[PDB]
Design a protein around this ligand. Structure first.
Ligand SMILES: Nc1nc2cc(Cl)ccc2n1CCCO
Length: 373
């Protein structure tokens, strides 16, 4: 159908993630919450922090229940640390429901909250398997679906260009995509893990053992800015991208995502840069489909001139189809049918002569062999 109250309920800063408004507690305390399909905890600032401007005040909530258990979430750059509890949660620009949910009240953190991001918490929309401290801590979306009649599905239109978009909870809004939704199976319910079966740069096959594309996994992750690629794939991809864009040379550092590249306002030569196609395993035997993104997706605008960072980066933990991938597409997390749908976003950034694309089917044999174990 349409979901007009949910359309345009996401905001963000470029490279700092998309957030949605949520209320916690009785009476409701409004907070801006990162929409993160790459994690499974609902965690909110619950104490002062230099970069937090409002936080969850549990003592002010009558419906707050203390679970009397700590949670510690270390990772690459830092950590967050907090106190588990439950409280009533709503999404003002969401479905008209209120659910009791687990909430991690973040008390201590390091390099978690980003200066000027305007979000104060994280909504992990992935599965319980990757929830902290363990999978017995039911994620918000699980609770939402269990406590209401909201279908087990959500969809994200992340528009990029300050950034905005939409999270449609419990449905698919046709106003937000053009052409067909193509579905890839969720290989395993933990992250939203998918299988990439082929990769092209301007139609030229990267020509690797397709396992390399999914080493050690490939996931769809709204909480990651970049397209991240396994070392082997990243190098081959960058090699090909360089070759395709070779009428202009850029510094080594640009390709590492360090340095900006700038052009006179409006003269960015999009056309010299190649499109990137990921073929995803289809739902039908021996069928794949492809999603195609533009440089307008993988060259992230950064603050006279129009400046950009290269938003494809190397990974050691597999492929991450982050906001770079997602901003081309309306992405349907069809949990009920263990699949993820892609269609061309009606809001994606493109130029006169090229658009992101979702096309299929393609005969692709032995696609299970592309999965890494
Ligand atoms: N999306 C995401 N949200 C996260 C939250 C934390 Cl605390 C750590 C890592 C996170 N990631 C990365 C997962 C994919 O590599």
């Amino acid at each position: 159908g349409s979901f007009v109250e949910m359309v345009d309920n996401l905001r963000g800063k470029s490279g700092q993630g998309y957030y949605v408004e949520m209320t916690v507690g009785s009476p409701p305390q409004t907070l801006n919450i990162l929409v993160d399909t790459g994690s499974s905890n609902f965690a909110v600032g619950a104490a002062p922090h230099p970069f937090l401007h409002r936080y969850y005040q549990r003592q002010l909530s009558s419906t707050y229940r203390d679970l009397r258990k700590g949670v510690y979430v270390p990772y690459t750059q830092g950590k967050w640390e907090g106190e588990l509890g439950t409280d009533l949660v709503s999404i003002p620009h969401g479905p008209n429901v209120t659910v009791r949910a687990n909430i991690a009240a973040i008390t201590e953190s390091d390099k978690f909250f980003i200066n000027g991001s305007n979000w104060e918490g994280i909504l992990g929309l992935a599965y319980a398997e990757i929830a902290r401290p363990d999978d017995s801590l039911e994620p918000f979306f699980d609770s939402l679906v269990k406590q209401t009649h909201v279908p087990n599905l959500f969809s994200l239109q992340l528009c990029g260009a300050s950034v905005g978009g939409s999270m449609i909870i419990g449905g698919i809004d046709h106003s937000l995509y053009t052409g067909s939704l193509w579905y890839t199976p969720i290989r395993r319910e933990w992250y939203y893990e998918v299988i990439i079966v082929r990769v092209e740069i301007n139609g030229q096959d990267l020509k690797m053992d397709c396992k390399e594309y999914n080493y050690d996994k490939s996931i769809v992750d709204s909480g990651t800015t970049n397209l991240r690629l396994p070392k082997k794939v990243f190098e081959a991809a960058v090699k090909s991208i360089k070759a395709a864009s070779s009428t202009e040379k850029f510094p080594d550092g640009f390709w590492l995502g360090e340095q900006l590249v700038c052009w006179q306002a409006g003269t960015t030569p999009w056309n010299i840069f190649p499109v990137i196609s990921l073929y995803l395993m289809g739902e039908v035997t021996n069928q794949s489909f492809r999603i195609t993104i533009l440089p307008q997706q993988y060259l992230r605008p950064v603050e006279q001139d129009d400046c950009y960072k290269f938003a494809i980066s190397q990974s050691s933990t597999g492929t991450v189809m982050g906001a770079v991938i997602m901003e081309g597409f309306y992405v349907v997390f069809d949990r009920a049918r263990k699949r993820i749908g892609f269609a061309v976003s009606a809001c994606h950034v493109h130029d006169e002569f090229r658009t992101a694309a979702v096309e299929g089917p393609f005969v692709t044999l032995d696609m299970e062999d592309c999965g890494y174990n």
